[PDB]
Amino acid sequence: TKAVHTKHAPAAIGPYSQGIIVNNMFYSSGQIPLTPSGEMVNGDIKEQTHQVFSNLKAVLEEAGASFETVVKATVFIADMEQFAEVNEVYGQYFDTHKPARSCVEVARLPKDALVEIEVIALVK
Amino acid sequence: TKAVHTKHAPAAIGPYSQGIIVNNMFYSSGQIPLTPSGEMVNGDIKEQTHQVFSNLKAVLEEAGASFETVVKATVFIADMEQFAEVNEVYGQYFDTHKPARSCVEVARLPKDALVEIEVIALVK
Amino acid sequence: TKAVHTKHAPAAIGPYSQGIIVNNMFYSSGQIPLTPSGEMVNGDIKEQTHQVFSNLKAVLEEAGASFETVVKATVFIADMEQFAEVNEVYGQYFDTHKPARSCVEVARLPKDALVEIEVIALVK
Ligand code: EMC
Ligand code: EMC
Ligand SMILES: [Hg+2]
């Protein structure tokens, strides 16, 4: 296995890696709405979801994967009432290639993020 | 890789698939107590859990897998006080074959479901 | 494919196994702060986190894996305010090897545990 590191996603500060490649698969850590420089995006839920996807895009590509090779995503949201809004952004990235997915509302997320998304993808 | 599609489980409406096959593994989306026609199952926690299992059975079989090949499941429930009830139904399907599992109470689930379950299984 | 069992981790009572090996990958069930004898270690978040890791170490080793081959972990904590404390202990185990990770505060964990962790690891 190998750790994935890219300056285009917030730095993994602490005991974890942005993602890991093992065999021919890639596992990302759960991405939250932080900018690469480590600041929380303070726009609405859509703006927060966009940063999450920019972060996912960066780690996926550094690992030799892409949204087109994602097989499973788990979405943790702070409020299920915002499902539709997060889904609108989500659908711009997984429009034709559609991964398996699970979505649940949690009590709280790191840095009180409104959304956190993790993915597993094939490395071709 | 292949998206799994079955008319014997609620349709995946939107940017996700009922399940995905990659390498020799199958990943399902989290299944909720909806009938194939899209209606939330009428009834208590056991009836809801049974519908979730009917949905998993449908996607597993379409993927060339079965409850006997499930390796890991994640169970999200609306109320931990109903754990025994969910477990009793869960046990009917994993009678002698026992997957790895994590079970937790979340704040809320899609469509206010009382239970949601996702599985990962080997494709024989 | 096969179930993993070790007397050095709490017995799996119910329809699940402590872990499952499929291909060259090990999937653990979520581990909570129970001692091998089945009772909650009493003590603060630090002691609870250490017990969860003792349990993970036992199932990992029985499966032929180790903390050094863990590729992804999912951490569930009862109180996000305890993130720093749990992270301090977590870092002692994933020191030179840093897996991908996701962390969320759910509504409730089995036995009102303060922390629960599941892992996926490579079997060398
Ligand atoms: C991607 C909507 Hg839970
Ligand atoms: C290991 C801190 Hg969520
Ligand atoms: Hg549970």
What CATH number should be reported for the domain holding residue C55? 3.30.1330.40
Residue C88 structural domain: 1-124
Q: Which atom of ligand 1 is nearest to the CA of A75?
A: 3
* CA gap A65, C20 in Å, rounded: 27
Look up residue A84 and give its two tokens. Answer: 């539709």
Please state, in angstroms and rounded to a whole number, the distance separating the CA atoms of residues A74 and C85. 25
Which atom of ligand 1 approaches the CA of A91 most closely? 1
Total number of domains constituting chain B: 1
Alpha-carbon distance of A120 to A20, in angstroms, equals 10
Residue of B nearest to C59 (CA): B100
Q: Distance from the CA of B105 to the center of ligand 3, in angstroms?
A: 6
Do A51 and A58 contact (CB within 8 A), yes or no? no
Q: Which of B69, B94, B100 sits opposite C29 (nearest CB)?
A: B100
SS3 assignment, position C85: helix
From CA B63, how far away is CA B122, in angstroms rounded? Answer: 10
Contacts of B42 (CB under 8 A, 6+ apart): none
A103 is catalytic: yes
Provide the terminal-to-terminal Cα distance of chain A, rounded to the nearest Å. 15
| Subunits in contact with chain C (3 or more CB pairs closer than 8 Å) | A, B
Q: Locate the ligand 2 atom nearest the alpha carbon of residue C77 and give its number.
A: 3
CA distance C51 to C44: 11
Q: How far is CA B19 from the centre of its chain?
A: 10
Q: Show the beta-strand stretches assigned E in chain C.
A: 2-4, 19-22, 25-28, 70-77, 100-105, 115-122
C-alpha C5/C-alpha C73 separation (Å) is 20
Closest Cβ–Cβ partner in C83, C102, C105 for A30: C102
33-52 in chain C: CB under 8 A from chain A: none
Cβ contacts of B42-50, under 8 Å, gap ≥ 24: B44/B85, B45/B82, B45/B85, B45/B86, B45/B114, B45/B115, B46/B85, B46/B86, B46/B88, B46/B89, B48/B113, B48/B114, B48/B115, B49/B85, B49/B86, B49/B89, B49/B90, B49/B115, B50/B89
Distance CA A103, CA A94 (A): 15
3-state secondary structure at position A75: strand
Is A71's Cβ below 8 Å from some Cβ in B? yes
How many beta-carbon pairs under 8 angstroms link B with C? 72
What pairs with residue C103 in β-bridges?
C75
* Separation of alpha carbons C115 and C30, rounded Å: 10
B83 touches chain C (CB under 8 A): yes
Query: In the numeric block, which tokens belong to residue C61?
Result: 């080793």
What is the largest distance, in Å, between two alpha-carbon atoms of chain C?
39
> How many other C-beta atoms are found inside a 10 Å radius of the C-beta of residue A42?
8
In angstroms, what CA-CA distances link A114 with A1, A110, C55, C89, C119?
31, 9, 32, 26, 25
Least Cα distance to B48 among B104, B88, B103 occurs for: B88
Ligand 2, atom 2, residue with closest C-alpha: C87
Measured from CB, residues less than 6 Å from any atom of ligand 2 are C 75, 77, 83, 86-87, 90, 103
Calculate the alpha carbon distances from B89 to B30, B85, C3 in Å.
Answer: 17, 7, 21
Produce one character per residue of A64-86: b if its CB has 16 or more CB atoms within 10 Å, e if not. ebbbebbbbbbbbbbebebbebb
- What spacing in Å lies between the alpha carbon of B23 and ligand 2's midpoint? 31
Q: How many whole angstroms separate alpha carbon A16 and alpha carbon A8?
A: 17
Task: State how far the Cα of A95 lies from the Cα of A68, in Å rounded to an integer.
Answer: 10
Task: Please give the C-alpha separations between residue B88 and each of B104, C42, C69, C74, in angstroms, as whole numbers.
Answer: 16, 29, 34, 26
Which residues on neighbouring strands pair with residue C34, listed in sequence order?
C40
Binding residues of B for substrate: 101
Binding-site annotation, residues of C: 101
In the DSSP assignment, the letter for residue B124 is -
CA closest to C75 among chain A residues? A30
Distance CA A50, CA B65 (A): 35
Chain-centre distance for alpha carbon B22: 18
* Adjacent-strand bridge partners of B100: B72
Report chain B residues whose CB lies below 8 A from the CB of A116. none
Residues of chain C in contact with residue A12, where contact means CB-CB under 8 angstroms, are: 98
State the sign of the Cα–Cα–Cα–Cα dihedral B62, B63, B64, B68: negative
Is A101 marked within a binding site? yes
